[PDB]
Amino acid sequence: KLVQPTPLLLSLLKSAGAQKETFTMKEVLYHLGQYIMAKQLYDEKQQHIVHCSNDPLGELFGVQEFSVKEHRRIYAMISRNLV
Numbered sequence: 525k526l527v528q529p530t531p532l533l534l535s536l537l538k539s540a541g542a543q544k545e546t547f548t549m550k551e552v553l554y555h556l557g558q559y560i561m562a563k564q565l566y567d568e569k570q571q572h573i574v575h576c577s578n579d580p581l582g583e584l585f586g587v588q589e590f591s592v593k594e595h596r597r598i599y600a601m602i603s604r605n606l607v
């Protein structure tokens with residue numbers, strides 16, 4: 525069952541390379557992960573946290589930072605941004 529990102533979430537994914545309006549969750553995760561790499565939001569050095577205090581992302585997930593290994597939380601954050 526495909527996900528349909530909200531216009532917000534979509535503009536991110538589109539600026540992250542996505543070329544369509546509906547996705548598999550893995551596809552969302554792939555572009556977002558690619559969005560995070562582009563905005564350099566990710567310190568591998570630190571402790572695998574993404575830092576988005578001042579990105580559209582952080583505003584979208586209603587969070588300042590998260591570990592890239594709190595998948596259960598990363599999924600919920602996304603879920604509230606799918607139509």
Ligand SMILES: CC(C)(C)C[C@@H]1N[C@@H](C(=O)NCC[C@H](O)CO)[C@H](c2cccc(Cl)c2F)[C@@]1(C#N)c1ccc(Cl)cc1F
Pocket residue numbers: 552553554556557558560561566572591592593594595596598599
């Ligand atoms: C390049 C990058 C950002 C590390 C990809 C991430 N890297 C995935 C990840 O688990 N990284 C852990 C690497 C660690 O060194 C242990 O080997 C993220 C990920 C993959 C699948 C499922 C989830 Cl919920 C997830 F968070 C990652 C991807 N792909 C990712 C993608 C989207 C988002 Cl919103 C957060 C993320 F951390």
